[PDB]
Design a protein around this motif. Structure first.
Motif, PDB file in Angstrom:
ATOM      1  N   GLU B  12       0.824  -1.205   0.000  1.00  0.00           N
ATOM      2  CA  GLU B  12       0.000   0.000   0.000  1.00  0.00           C
ATOM      3  C   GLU B  12       0.861   1.258   0.000  1.00  0.00           C
ATOM      4  OE1 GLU B  12      -2.946  -0.006   3.082  1.00  0.00           O
ATOM      5  OE2 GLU B  12      -4.256   1.327   1.930  1.00  0.00           O
ATOM      6  N   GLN B  25      -0.976   7.882   6.547  1.00  0.00           N
ATOM      7  CA  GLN B  25      -2.232   7.222   6.885  1.00  0.00           C
ATOM      8  C   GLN B  25      -2.022   5.733   7.115  1.00  0.00           C
ATOM      9  OE1 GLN B  25      -5.551   8.261   4.147  1.00  0.00           O
ATOM     10  NE2 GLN B  25      -4.525  10.249   3.981  1.00  0.00           N
ATOM     11  N   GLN B  33      -3.362  -0.146  15.077  1.00  0.00           N
ATOM     12  CA  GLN B  33      -3.950  -1.477  15.118  1.00  0.00           C
ATOM     13  C   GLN B  33      -3.003  -2.536  15.662  1.00  0.00           C
ATOM     14  OE1 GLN B  33      -6.341  -3.255  12.236  1.00  0.00           O
ATOM     15  NE2 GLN B  33      -7.979  -1.791  12.700  1.00  0.00           N
ATOM     16  N   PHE B  34      -1.689  -2.340  15.541  1.00  0.00           N
ATOM     17  CA  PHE B  34      -0.737  -3.349  15.981  1.00  0.00           C
ATOM     18  C   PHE B  34      -0.009  -2.993  17.266  1.00  0.00           C
ATOM     19  CE2 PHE B  34      -0.687  -6.331  12.458  1.00  0.00           C
ATOM     20  CZ  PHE B  34      -1.333  -5.611  11.483  1.00  0.00           C
TER      21      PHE B  34
ATOM     22  N   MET C   3      -6.373  -4.950  10.560  1.00  0.00           N
ATOM     23  CA  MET C   3      -5.664  -4.152   9.564  1.00  0.00           C
ATOM     24  C   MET C   3      -6.000  -4.606   8.148  1.00  0.00           C
ATOM     25  SD  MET C   3      -3.838  -1.668   8.808  1.00  0.00           S
ATOM     26  CE  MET C   3      -2.466  -0.897   9.663  1.00  0.00           C
ATOM     27  N   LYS C   4      -6.114  -5.919   7.939  1.00  0.00           N
ATOM     28  CA  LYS C   4      -6.456  -6.428   6.615  1.00  0.00           C
ATOM     29  C   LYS C   4      -7.844  -5.970   6.184  1.00  0.00           C
ATOM     30  CE  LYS C   4      -6.641 -10.702   3.905  1.00  0.00           C
ATOM     31  NZ  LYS C   4      -6.475 -12.182   3.929  1.00  0.00           N
ATOM     32  N   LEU C   6      -9.475  -3.305   7.242  1.00  0.00           N
ATOM     33  CA  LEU C   6      -9.419  -1.868   6.989  1.00  0.00           C
ATOM     34  C   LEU C   6      -8.796  -1.572   5.631  1.00  0.00           C
ATOM     35  CD1 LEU C   6      -8.562  -0.148  10.386  1.00  0.00           C
ATOM     36  CD2 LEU C   6     -10.549   0.204   8.916  1.00  0.00           C
ATOM     37  N   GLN C   7      -7.726  -2.289   5.283  1.00  0.00           N
ATOM     38  CA  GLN C   7      -7.104  -2.104   3.977  1.00  0.00           C
ATOM     39  C   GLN C   7      -8.056  -2.498   2.855  1.00  0.00           C
ATOM     40  OE1 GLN C   7      -3.320  -4.013   3.449  1.00  0.00           O
ATOM     41  NE2 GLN C   7      -2.165  -2.343   4.405  1.00  0.00           N
ATOM     42  N   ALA C   8      -8.820  -3.575   3.050  1.00  0.00           N
ATOM     43  CA  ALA C   8      -9.807  -3.973   2.050  1.00  0.00           C
ATOM     44  C   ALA C   8     -10.883  -2.908   1.883  1.00  0.00           C
ATOM     45  CB  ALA C   8     -10.433  -5.313   2.434  1.00  0.00           C
ATOM     46  N   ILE C   9     -11.349  -2.335   2.995  1.00  0.00           N
ATOM     47  CA  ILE C   9     -12.336  -1.261   2.929  1.00  0.00           C
ATOM     48  C   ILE C   9     -11.771  -0.074   2.161  1.00  0.00           C
ATOM     49  CG2 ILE C   9     -13.501   0.474   4.324  1.00  0.00           C
ATOM     50  CD1 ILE C   9     -13.634  -1.957   6.472  1.00  0.00           C
ATOM     51  N   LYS C  10     -10.513   0.280   2.432  1.00  0.00           N
ATOM     52  CA  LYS C  10      -9.875   1.376   1.709  1.00  0.00           C
ATOM     53  C   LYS C  10      -9.790   1.086   0.218  1.00  0.00           C
ATOM     54  CE  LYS C  10      -7.837   5.184   0.883  1.00  0.00           C
ATOM     55  NZ  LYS C  10      -6.488   5.285   1.503  1.00  0.00           N
ATOM     56  N   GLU C  12     -11.588  -0.916  -1.626  1.00  0.00           N
ATOM     57  CA  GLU C  12     -12.910  -0.867  -2.243  1.00  0.00           C
ATOM     58  C   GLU C  12     -13.416   0.567  -2.353  1.00  0.00           C
ATOM     59  OE1 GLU C  12     -15.707  -3.486  -0.375  1.00  0.00           O
ATOM     60  OE2 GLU C  12     -16.884  -3.660  -2.220  1.00  0.00           O
ATOM     61  N   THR C  26     -20.007   0.559   1.410  1.00  0.00           N
ATOM     62  CA  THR C  26     -18.885  -0.127   2.043  1.00  0.00           C
ATOM     63  C   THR C  26     -18.746   0.271   3.506  1.00  0.00           C
ATOM     64  OG1 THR C  26     -17.852   0.171  -0.117  1.00  0.00           O
ATOM     65  CG2 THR C  26     -16.558  -0.909   1.597  1.00  0.00           C
ATOM     66  N   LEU C  29     -21.532  -1.333   5.590  1.00  0.00           N
ATOM     67  CA  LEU C  29     -21.233  -2.740   5.832  1.00  0.00           C
ATOM     68  C   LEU C  29     -20.151  -2.891   6.889  1.00  0.00           C
ATOM     69  CD1 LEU C  29     -22.344  -5.320   5.122  1.00  0.00           C
ATOM     70  CD2 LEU C  29     -20.867  -5.495   3.115  1.00  0.00           C
ATOM     71  N   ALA C  30     -19.127  -2.037   6.836  1.00  0.00           N
ATOM     72  CA  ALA C  30     -18.067  -2.085   7.836  1.00  0.00           C
ATOM     73  C   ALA C  30     -18.615  -1.824   9.233  1.00  0.00           C
ATOM     74  CB  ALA C  30     -16.982  -1.071   7.485  1.00  0.00           C
ATOM     75  N   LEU C  48      -9.083   6.506   6.073  1.00  0.00           N
ATOM     76  CA  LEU C  48      -9.701   6.674   4.761  1.00  0.00           C
ATOM     77  C   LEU C  48      -9.628   8.121   4.303  1.00  0.00           C
ATOM     78  CD1 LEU C  48     -13.092   4.749   5.041  1.00  0.00           C
ATOM     79  CD2 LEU C  48     -11.006   3.852   4.047  1.00  0.00           C
TER      80      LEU C  48
ATOM     81  N   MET D   3     -16.906  -9.761   6.793  1.00  0.00           N
ATOM     82  CA  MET D   3     -16.722  -8.641   5.876  1.00  0.00           C
ATOM     83  C   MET D   3     -15.953  -9.065   4.630  1.00  0.00           C
ATOM     84  SD  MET D   3     -17.337  -5.648   5.015  1.00  0.00           S
ATOM     85  CE  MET D   3     -17.581  -4.160   5.982  1.00  0.00           C
ATOM     86  N   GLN D   7     -17.352  -8.854   0.815  1.00  0.00           N
ATOM     87  CA  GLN D   7     -16.622  -8.141  -0.225  1.00  0.00           C
ATOM     88  C   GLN D   7     -16.334  -9.047  -1.415  1.00  0.00           C
ATOM     89  OE1 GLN D   7     -13.044  -6.184   1.045  1.00  0.00           O
ATOM     90  NE2 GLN D   7     -14.115  -4.347   1.765  1.00  0.00           N
ATOM     91  N   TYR D  47     -25.849  -3.682   0.887  1.00  0.00           N
ATOM     92  CA  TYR D  47     -24.451  -3.546   0.497  1.00  0.00           C
ATOM     93  C   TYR D  47     -24.256  -3.834  -0.988  1.00  0.00           C
ATOM     94  CZ  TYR D  47     -19.552  -4.769  -0.060  1.00  0.00           C
ATOM     95  OH  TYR D  47     -18.256  -4.867  -0.509  1.00  0.00           O
TER      96      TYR D  47
END
Lengths: 193, 193, 193, 193, 193, 193, 193, 193, 193, 193
Positions: B12, B25, B33-34, C3-4, C6-10, C12, C26, C29-30, C48, D3, D7, D47
């Motif tokens: 990313e 970001q 998150q970590f 984190m995964k 959140l990255q998928a949401i970003k 999309e 999106t 749904l989140a 985001l 989720m 997706q 969604y």
């Protein structure tokens, strides 16, 4: 490791020759996050590196291990066998760390002792434009040049030595052969095939 | 972290220079998150950032940590060693938070103190059309400009300074050099190589 | 979250401006599947949304929360602090639901109060064909227009106002300016640069 | 659901209008493998489906549920509220199955009662070749035509009605308008713009 | 049933294709009113549909029954004969209803799976006015087409596809080869044999 | 199964018609690794195969099951219902294996009894070069030809029958129509549109 | 294994013929990380390898196993059946290792005994440039040549034998037929169609 | 068996290729009626098929037996000799049936794996009418082609591929090089030597 | 055995092909004299001839072993291991005899399975005299034929088939193409290039 | 049964199509004489005719079984297994009789379900005399028609429909296109090409 993580490491590394900054970054992250033994490191090497460059890695790693053993390496008892086997022992954390460090350092000489690498064969196309050539050659250097390199002088020289056959005259014509990279970038902006 | 998450963060981030809004970001989401320690943050930096820009990050981070220690930072006992080691301690949550904040803030000066960045070298092609050039230069600024920037004036000026050699005359001809970006977008709509 | 996810949401959402139907779908749904708190929602927004549009979201959300608090919102005791903190409490499920609803509704005004959006800057290319232009402008409207919009009239008008410079005459020539979109689609089928 | 799975369902479905064979296959697999309740189905609909087509789905689903309730549906006690709420109850497995079946069947009329769909607007390009046009129109029909359709006659007619302006004469010239699709495929093999 | 009821059903259905909406309306009404068992339904199928269509419907019903018994009818146990045998039992009412529903649904797949249907073979007469031809097409399509499939686009395509060659040329001259149905009705009014 | 694994199977299979070597390999791996029941196999078939080809699969599978039951199949007690239901029983491992084998074998006749498949419609383009045509037709045969096929003779014949209109003369001109595939590959190397 | 890991192995291997360095690397990593039995190895072979090349693998593997059994293989009791079954036994770790090694070694002869492979059919295009041809032929050799090959001489010869029809004269004209690969790379840099 | 039965089987099979549907029908009938052991099947294979085809079938049977024993025959224990030895035992009936099935299935792979089959080498005679040639092709393909493979496309391709050169020219003039079989039959009727 | 014995054997077979009468004589004498076990026979096989021919002999030996095991062997106990293992016993001498006979008989079908044989591909040179070519052909036949093959008709045919073009014309002019070999020798006695 | 009986039956049906009167006579005699079970009948079905026709007969037999089971059979106990299994009983002779009758009746609708029938596709040759073609058509009718079909009108129509073009012109000139068959035979008696 796990097979998925190893495949991900391969896919991230696949475009970089052994010893390159991207190669070393990915492999160092793998070693740190997975804490592999000598057997796991050997499997990783054989899966990533081809037979020739894996053999070259072993040729350097044996010399490094001989240096460490002759000079004294912490936690290693010579009566307990060699360092490769002692790394596989689950109770020898420090020896495992030291063997991983030696394994990583053995990758430094693979591009540093390589002969006539691919990035040297990056000849500018007869009609390929110079602005894209600079980016292509930067990408090639980022994937075939060893760590700790003085990259910018070599980039500066390769911008002329490997330049287009007409650009070989054009760069001297505008008087920017010995100038920094930005000066040649400005100089060749007007060129067209 | 985990190796897959670190690789995702790299993929990313890969298109953004350190300190860019996208870079910041993703790294801020990773830190939140970590909840990494100093060792994890160092591994993340070395895996993402090249050696030169990681060294630059450390050069700024040491100054930031010196500022925090000299001015007093909550939960830090100087007798307990430095802040980097005290962050790694699992019972020091607040010091860990503060070190993560300092680590993130050390990234702000990397593009803010960078010299001659790549987005400044975005010269419009000799036959590249201006409508696509605006989008390309916007993308370049979004990946190489520091946070908190006054982006729009710089975009307005770069739309002319880095414009096409013919567009350099065309923009003055229609009298839209000092107008907002939309005015030049309308002005150069009719241009063709 | 994770984190995964959140990255998928970003990934999309990345092609849709805040408040767009895809964005809202999106994000809804989140929110439904992850049931985030105020801190998680703030992290999601900052990851985001850019700084400017996150600040705009907060400017609308504070007004929405003031409306809810002044008008009475179920389960909220004013003595217990503000709504943002009370949402983070793990035993306040209903207040969390209400704050998530307010957070989602604060996104409705971001494109509804935006000034001169990108979809308005979709000018048809000088040689770009009109059939592809219709699809491109539909895609642009689907990613920059707010929810609850009367999209079809705006599409009908933008098919002419932003049309090709020759199409601006062609549409009037065939007498289909005020007709539905299909009529102009049939009308401009024969056009070629 | 989860989720990530939602997706994935969206990404597989995104190219198919509601009610299409691909749409129905993916949604049926989702319903079978995840066994969703009424709330989960509503979230899935909102969604995936846009507001207009979700409202259309509800308009058909209410009629279907009224039919089922008036005609008698197994396991449903009218005193226990409506079918939507009774589906959400975790001990009502059979009612949940029946509501999922009604939800899936409500999607059948969305393309069956749609007005002037996108696959009807597939006009052959002025210079687009007919061999690629056949495949493009087949793909369009596979993504916008309802289940249980007599697809092949409609394909046969659309191969002429939506054909190229010159192909409209060419097909009659070779006398293959009323012949099967393969006959026109052979007939237009020699055409070129 | 009774003989008179079956004869009336056939006379109402005779003008309608198998699987047609006119067919399905009458057959569903007969199933609802008479509550027929497997034997009565088999007799009705033999009386209405020809032997070939009877075989196709039996194939569809066998597929549907196999799928339902694999997924599980509410009261069907894997014993005391197949579902057809258990439908004849007066006690097993639910099995009778389920068999009736599957038997009815088996018809609906015949028009969607029929090869070379006759409704698409009805062409415009040489001297037949376009109004009479479109009336015939509407009569054929409002019956022959399956249940719920979109009919209006099929008219808008086939009325040109199945038009007379001179009428097709007139449509080409009018430029209404893809215009709405009313536009083609207006355009072809002036035609005369 | 799981929804993600089913989607992966679909995405791997999507380019291959039922019964093709790639199709059969992926489906066999799925059956081996997941050990599905009759209900799971039915869901897999309905999700992968279209309604028509799923019905064709059932038409062959019923014949196969009738053969197995009439000839005697191990572990199957006829009094215990049909094979489809007995497969779903969790204590009938051997019957489940046999039903999975029959399900897989029912896919062999779908391309073997298909009429006029897509790979037969692979006509060489009027200006498409023959070297790329060979690879395209090989790919088409690999995705539409049944298992156990004598592929190479059919490839040899299709290299001429479906060849370019000029190549139809060229192959006879060089006298390589009846020679192996490599001979025509050498023969048409010099051709150009 | 798991289905996802097997699919990943296939996708990584799909571009490499059996026995190639990439093929062998991926399969060796799979065998090491998953430790498969004979049944798992058979499933892996049938899923990856086509029927013909799986049969060829078995033809070589039976010879290898006969060699091992006749010459004595550790841990194998002949009275306990064959090696394939004894590998499946969960308590026979060493025999499992030996059978996996034999399975991997059986892949070495598949490209080593293959007849007229695809990499030999890599003819340079009539207008394809030689610089891209070198990379294409290197990629082809990397995916179709067996392990332990003397690749560079074969590359050197194939650079001429499979060269462009004009390059066949050009290479002799500049006198670089017998020189290393770099010499021909320099020689053909000036060529253009 | 008996000598007369074997001779009758050979006379029925003599006109048919090994692995052909005519071969498989008679051989399956013989296996079903006579219930042969391994010795009887080996004798029958030696009597019908030549030594080379016997070796190919033994290779196929060895592969099939190895796969089945790896996956597990119902009654085959890894003891008391291989599956061939245990087939001769009268008590182990199930093993005999499984061996019979595998032995029968071994034949079916011969036509699919045969190289340069004779059915594709049957060409049209110079003075042979096209009707006689297509009859000969149908006779050869209805036998030589493997079990269940699609034959009609193979005729539609090979009848032009294997046609006489003058007949091929006539097909080219008729434009029916890819027309259905009936169309090519009609087109070539007028040909005369 | 001893190393010198095997070296002498290989020197004897240095010219003789696998299956040649000289090869068979010396190998039969070696087997008779040294009474080798199965491991010894495998070592001798691997030493005498290359990998491909060793593999083909393994296939032949496996076929013979399977056939004899199915039919029955002198002292075979299938419970007590395979033939290749049981032959490695000081006690089971009689089974070792049969394994040796099978090992020799596997060579008998080896030259007959050769593809593109060289024992019948000896060609006369342009200036090579006829009698020298005939003598070389006779030597190659005695050194390359399979055991027991009639050499006289093969020599008679190959004296003209493989003769030099000058010798071919001389034979054709004399009409001695199918004469006795003595007539070829007499007729070509007076000719020399 | 016995193998010789089935071989004689197939020789009798070698020319007769499934459903031909000769086929039906010999098959009916076989069923009457040998009183076969359901397994025996399936073996005979698989041996007499190919896979496609066997599958169509299975569909017909399934339709008849379902219809009779729904209506009722002589000694049918649905609790005690299906018809195909219950017929395999020494006790249930009466049900075996009905299964045999159903098996024969399934052939009655088999020729009527044929697509593009060959029993009415016999065409006269260019030089073929009229009476020979008429005799062949009559033989093909007696050998290919379905049972009970009136052959006289079919022969009368096909004597002109399938006649040679010369014979067609002769009939048209004489005006004997729809005459009695004797008049065709008399009128064409004097004509011969």
């Amino acid at each position: 490791w796990q097979m998925k993580d190893l495949q991900a490491i391969k896919q991230e590394v696949s475009q970089a020759a052994p010893g390159s900054p991207q190669f070393m970054q990915t492999i160092r992250l793998a070693v740190q996050q997975f804490d592999p033994t000598a057997k796991d490191l050997q499997d990783l090497l054989q899966y990533l590196c081809s037979s020739l460059v894996a053999s070259l890695h072993h040729q350097q790693l044996d010399s490094l291990i001989s240096e460490a053993e002759t000079r004294g390496i912490t936690g290693y008892n010579p009566l307990a066998g060699p360092l490769r086997v002692q790394a596989n022992n689950p109770q020898q954390q420090g020896l495992r760390r030291e063997y991983q460090q030696l394994w990583l350092a053995a990758f430094a000489a693979l591009p540093g002792s390589a002969k006539d690498p691919s990035w040297a064969s990056i000849l500018q196309g007869l009609e390929e434009p110079y602005h894209a050539f600079v980016e292509r050659l930067n990408i090639a250097l980022d994937n075939g040049l060893p760590e700790g390199t003085p990259k910018d002088p070599i980039l500066r020289s390769l911008a002329y030595s490997n330049a287009n056959k007409e650009c070989q005259k054009l760069l001297q014509a505008r008087g920017h052969t010995n100038s920094p990279l930005g000066d040649m970038l400005r100089a060749c902006q007007t060129w067209t095939p």
